[PDB]
Design a protein around this motif. Sequence first.
Motif, mmCIF file in Angstrom:
data_model
loop_
_atom_site.group_PDB
_atom_site.id
_atom_site.type_symbol
_atom_site.label_atom_id
_atom_site.label_comp_id
_atom_site.label_asym_id
_atom_site.label_seq_id
_atom_site.Cartn_x
_atom_site.Cartn_y
_atom_site.Cartn_z
ATOM 1 N N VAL C 162 -1.506 -4.444 2.945
ATOM 2 C CA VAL C 162 -1.584 -3.004 3.547
ATOM 3 C C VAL C 162 -3.085 -2.684 3.945
ATOM 4 N N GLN C 163 -3.592 -2.447 4.961
ATOM 5 C CA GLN C 163 -4.851 -2.209 5.317
ATOM 6 C C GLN C 163 -5.295 -1.017 4.762
ATOM 7 N N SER C 165 -7.337 1.544 6.092
ATOM 8 C CA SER C 165 -7.547 2.760 6.626
ATOM 9 C C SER C 165 -6.151 3.297 6.772
ATOM 10 N N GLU C 166 -5.140 2.790 6.489
ATOM 11 C CA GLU C 166 -3.791 3.222 6.227
ATOM 12 C C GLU C 166 -3.556 4.167 5.086
ATOM 13 N N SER C 168 -3.695 6.858 3.108
ATOM 14 C CA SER C 168 -3.874 8.517 3.410
ATOM 15 C C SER C 168 -2.800 9.084 2.736
ATOM 16 N N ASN C 171 0.965 9.707 4.841
ATOM 17 C CA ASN C 171 1.668 8.203 4.984
ATOM 18 C C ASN C 171 1.732 7.329 3.551
ATOM 19 N N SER C 172 1.031 8.002 2.667
ATOM 20 C CA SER C 172 1.282 7.558 1.203
ATOM 21 C C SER C 172 2.716 7.305 0.736
ATOM 22 N N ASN C 174 4.898 5.774 2.094
ATOM 23 C CA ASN C 174 5.427 4.770 3.108
ATOM 24 C C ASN C 174 5.358 3.405 2.423
ATOM 25 N N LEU C 175 4.841 3.291 1.072
ATOM 26 C CA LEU C 175 4.050 2.225 0.534
ATOM 27 C C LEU C 175 4.892 1.925 -0.727
#
Lengths: 296, 585, 186, 187
Positions: C162-163, C165-166, C168, C171-172, C174-175
């Motif tokens: 997972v990059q 910049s992703e 945050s 969008n947290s 989402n992982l």
Amino acid sequence: VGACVLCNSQTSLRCGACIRRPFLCCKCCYDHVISTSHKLVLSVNPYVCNAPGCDVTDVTQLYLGGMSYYCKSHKPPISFPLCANGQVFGLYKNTCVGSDNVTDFNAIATCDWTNAGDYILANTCTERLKLFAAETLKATEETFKLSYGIATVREVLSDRELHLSWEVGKPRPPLNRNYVFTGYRVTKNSKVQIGEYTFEKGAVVYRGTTTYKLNVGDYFVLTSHTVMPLSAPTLVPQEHYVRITGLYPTLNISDEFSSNVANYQKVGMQKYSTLQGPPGTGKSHFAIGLALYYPS
Amino acid sequence: VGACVLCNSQTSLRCGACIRRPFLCCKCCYDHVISTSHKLVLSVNPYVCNAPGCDVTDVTQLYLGGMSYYCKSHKPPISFPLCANGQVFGLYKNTCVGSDNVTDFNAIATCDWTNAGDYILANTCTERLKLFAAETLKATEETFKLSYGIATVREVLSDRELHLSWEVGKPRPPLNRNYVFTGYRVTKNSKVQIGEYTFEKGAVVYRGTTTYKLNVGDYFVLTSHTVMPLSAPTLVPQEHYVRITGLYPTLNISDEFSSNVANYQKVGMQKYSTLQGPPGTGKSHFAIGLALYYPSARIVYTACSHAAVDALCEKALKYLPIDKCSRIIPAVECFDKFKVNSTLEQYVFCTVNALPETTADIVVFDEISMATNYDLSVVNARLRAKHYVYIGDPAQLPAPRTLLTKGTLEPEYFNSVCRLMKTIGPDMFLGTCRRCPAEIVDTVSALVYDNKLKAHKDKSAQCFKMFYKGVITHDVSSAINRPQIGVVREFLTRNPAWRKAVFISPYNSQNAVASKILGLPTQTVDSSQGSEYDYVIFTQTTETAHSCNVNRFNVAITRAKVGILCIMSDRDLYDKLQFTSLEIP
Amino acid sequence: FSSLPSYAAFATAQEAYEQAVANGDSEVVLKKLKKSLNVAKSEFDRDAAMQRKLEKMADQAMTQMYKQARSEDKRAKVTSAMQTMLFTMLRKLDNDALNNIINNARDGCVPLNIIPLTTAAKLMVVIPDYNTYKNTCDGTTFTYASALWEIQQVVDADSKIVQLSEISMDNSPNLAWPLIVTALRA
Amino acid sequence: FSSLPSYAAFATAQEAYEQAVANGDSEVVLKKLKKSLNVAKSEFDRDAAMQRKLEKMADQAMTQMYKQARSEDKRAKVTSAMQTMLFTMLRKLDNDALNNIINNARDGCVPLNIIPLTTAAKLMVVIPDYNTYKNTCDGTTFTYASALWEIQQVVDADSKIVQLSEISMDNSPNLAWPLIVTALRAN
RNA sequence: AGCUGCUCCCUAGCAUGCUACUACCGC
RNA sequence: GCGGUAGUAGCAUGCUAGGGAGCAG
Ligand SMILES: [Zn+2]
Ligand SMILES: [Zn+2]
Ligand SMILES: [Zn+2]
Ligand SMILES: [Zn+2]
Ligand SMILES: [Zn+2]
Ligand SMILES: [Zn+2]
């Protein structure tokens, strides 16, 4: 260290002057020592006057002095009677119950096994006393069998006959296969291996187990083994179960054990059964039919 | 090193000849040693004669000599009596208060748990003393169950039946599922893993837990676990708070729990409340409506057996969010749709044998009657919760008591929750019998239930009672009546629709032969709770204290909703029960 | 020890001899009380000697068995006392490099290897949530063990890279949040 | 010490003493019953105190011989154990190769450090690092002591099975590294 | 899980010795 | 009035035995 003969009480005393050196409890051992000529007792240590050059072997003449057992004139001022209260000094003192009737055990201990009444005694006394009766019986005759002369060969006549001398002093056992001899080859070092033979008069016919050629001077003895004490009684107690437990009956039977099947019907139900075996009725047949009825 | 049983004074002495080896204070231990046959005491060292080859085990015969404890004749000149002043020598000597009444705990220690008076003592004595009564009771009968023969298989006839031999010397246990066996596979090294089966007579029919093929010579045993003394008493003291503390009420409610909501109003305001749990009124509905009333709380769905917690699991599949559910059974087949072994979740569905040490909000304990003091105390040892909820009812069924032989144990003294349920009354109940018709519900109201159970729908005119006499034949652990199997013989003829009225039976083997004659399904009266059928037939078959028991048979009667058959051969319940009656064919 | 029965007889004999010596009458009548009083200290110091040694016998045996009880109760709890003692010493130690990692482990940043000490060498630190990410990792620099590391290989729990910049807040969710954030020391 | 010939006599002497003291006839009566308690005391001196020592002696002797009996039992047990160990370990060694190697000695006495060399049916290698592994046990087969061995069951310090493909150069720092390779005697 | 050597502490036993109390015996 | 012996208690020394712990190579 174990249980005495009559009482089965835990004990540590063994009669030295007795035939097979069995265990005896304090009161039980004292009853034995007065009701017999067996005047020797042997605990974890020997009960003999340990002062130098003494002969006394009877327990009553012995007294405890210090770290040993002492006679009349060898004792120190401080002493104590080993034979007191009708129970001899020994390990497991209080755990002795004694036997009300000991004269049977004294009889077997003083027995020479010579008349029929001795054998009546052998099978009348109780369980391990009669096991001991068999033990002492076989012991006396195995000590006997070597007390005969010894069949030394002098000359070689031909096949199947020889000439035998016997040592002076002791007699000749009978002329049958009842007493099986056994020989070893006398050499410059020792005696090694002939085999089991039995001799009759010719000249002396020799019946040897195997094919063998003998020379002058080789001699044969009636050997005995080392007879150890037994554990189990003559036979287990009888018990009759409801059914044939632990065996799976057969599916179909052949004719020549039909009269036999109706017998294994009951033996499979309980522990043991004595088999009235009149000779030659299909006896080993009767035994193989046990496996035919139960193969696995 | 701890506190004694009666006095709770700090001590270090443990009675060797006693059943469970408890702590005893000096004077307290001496009071036990003289008031029982328990003549062995075991402190931080053993009180025996340490001179070589001694056998004395009583403490009075022992005297202290030097650094040991000596008998009469083994002592040195310097000695001292261990038993003096009515208090045996031991650690924490002065800090002993003694017990005025010790004979109760002497009786429990010398008890064999044979008669009903033994159980009366087990529940009448004081708090940790009665917990110890439960400890000793159980400990005894697990020492009992393995004193029976071993079920060694001999032959493999076919599926579902085998041939069984038993070891000589010790008897054969009863032929039911009451005594659950467990097997291992005998090999050249050791025995490993068959599983739990129960055996009945064919031939030996075996009811196995899982599918499995057996061979000759494999044997099963009645295993026991390692029973370890509890901590907490049977249940915590009662305290009535002013308001529902620690809980946040709901916003709106559905209709099907309204009669339940006006109930949870009070279990929420104090800690515990025994629930008169009449069979099949929405009992697990009661349990789930607790969560419907309080969703965020942790509700602890447990029971003495897994088949009973499965009932609360069934209504979790339909009313409970499964995202927050948990199914706990350790490494038996059960309801395993929830996540297995998830400790910190809201709904935990488990059985007392496996509930892990946790803390939760409210507990719902299904079937408080099947349980003894033991598990009903180990639940408190498991949870010190805000609210306790007691599902079950003594008028339903107790656990089967193996050692109870003479006399029956009354509704009062099955366990501690059974105490206040009919002395101060139950705090709680549900009266809407969602199952029974007016034929049965009015009959059971005037039975033991304080004329309580109101009718649900109607008088079905489908439940039948008929009087008989019967002749009884019993052989080993059963009882078979041929003529009462000969009355169902002919009644199932004119009806083509009562083919599906399941056969209930007091003893399973009698209906096992009947099903060889008839073929209807089986049912055990002892563990009948959990499933209910519209149509069931039954025969009491016996007038003694097995089937004519009021609550043991109330369950058989109460599980039918339209029609039921009860062939009565007794006078105890004929004048007491009222159905429609027919003549004798 | 005065509460023994023989003490009373000794006291009576002593009173008799005190009266005799206060009167000083005879030679043999008082000598009776040297055949009856000199005995009176024979069944007194014989009975009051053995009991006094018995007292200390009981005391010594009790102390021995108390010590044995303490010894059996101590060597059966070592694996709680060791940890308690360790943490008390650690909080007494007062070193920031320790407190940082102790707090981080108290909320979740447990390393998955021995923390390397060279200027090179690799580190992997589990991060289970986002609020934890806020304090530790800022941009490209990783603050841990009071050191400065360089962020290189953020990855989710399903083994998918997972990059950076992703990462945050919006969008947290989402992982697969148990991130394994490999890094290298300064 | 209460059932000895002397308890009766001392009791009779003291009974006469108390009876005639209650009577209290003459000073000679007191003298006689004092010289009776002063001789019958010797009776309870030796009759109940030297026999009080014989009990100590007898108990000492009894415990001593109890201890010696246990001493002579432990000997039998250790003898049985040692002979069983001998007779069970012998069973593994008598291969025919031992006969072939001994029968060819000029005398029959062969050195000990050549018996396992030319007769053992299994070799055990211990390698500290991969560099030594490459020059000793590389591949499935290798030759030591002028024989041919084949490798199976490679393990490590934690005694977990390790396959042969894992031990490369770069994978080496990821293995517990007293690796113990065991091999069989190929023929 | 070794071989010695020195030192402390506790208890037991025997013997020796010392002292005190009682009894017997003549002188 | 002395001596001696037998007893009992107390005390000391020493020797052996058993147990615990510490130091040095
Ligand atoms: Zn004899
Ligand atoms: Zn005997
Ligand atoms: Zn002599
Ligand atoms: Zn007890
Ligand atoms: Zn107490
Ligand atoms: Zn003893």
